[PDB]
């Protein structure tokens, strides 16, 4: 399960779009509150892509549906705080679409 969970989370991070740019790198680590106090006033449950790798080693996620529940939570946390048309907004829309195709290849093939 840990080998499968790493294959899905690493595919979403390593995923580059059709201009060669990596979408994940800005979602990989959350900003400090000192830096951006607005995200931590507006977003309820802040989680990043390294806090998901942390919870894959600590075995907090019991199934592949619990890993998905918190990848949708940060990708949805980004969408609220950022704008509809923002570069960060539409990549959390793509990172949900690349996680839902990455889990569908590893978990059943």
């Amino acid at each position: 399960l840990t080998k499968q969970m790493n294959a899905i989370i690493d595919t979403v991070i390593n995923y580059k779009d059709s201009s060669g740019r990596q979408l994940s790198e800005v979602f990989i680590q959350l900003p400090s509150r000192k830096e951006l106090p607005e995200y931590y006033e507006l977003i309820r449950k802040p989680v990043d892509f390294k806090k998901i790798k942390e919870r894959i080693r600590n075995h907090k996620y019991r199934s592949l549906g619990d890993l998905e529940k918190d990848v949708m939570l940060l990708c949805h946390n980004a969408q609220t705080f950022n704008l509809e048309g923002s570069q960060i907004y539409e990549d959390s829309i793509v990172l949900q679409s690349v996680f839902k195709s990455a889990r569908q290849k590893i978990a059943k093939e």
Binding site: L42, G65, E68, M72, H76, Q79, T80, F81, E84, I93, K100, Q104
Partner: protein, 89 residues
């Protein structure tokens, strides 16, 4: 990213997926291993207004411009309250 909500009388409502997800019940029905969803119980004059709320909520949440009251006519109030509770909006 658009999504199709279909009323009892069979009207089709195309709204942004993110706008729809503001409803916990829709979030549940859509999330996991579909872009259409059918409401057997919700008429159009109601589901139309439910969408208008999504538009409103999405737009005015976290907006510094002072927020306007989301109006509800008496004629629609009760059925909307029902729909609202079912949706978890």
């Amino acid at each position: 990213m658009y999504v199709k909500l279909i009323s009892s009388d069979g009207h089709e409502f195309i709204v942004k997926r993110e706008h729809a997800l503001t409803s916990g019940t829709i979030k549940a029905m859509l999330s996991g291993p579909t872009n259409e969803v059918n409401f057997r119980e919700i008429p159009s004059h109601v589901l139309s207004k439910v969408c208008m709320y999504f538009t409103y909520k999405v737009r005015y949440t976290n907006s510094s411009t002072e927020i306007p009251e989301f109006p509800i006519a008496p004629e629609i109030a009760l059925e909307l309250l029902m729909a609202a509770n079912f949706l978890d909006c």
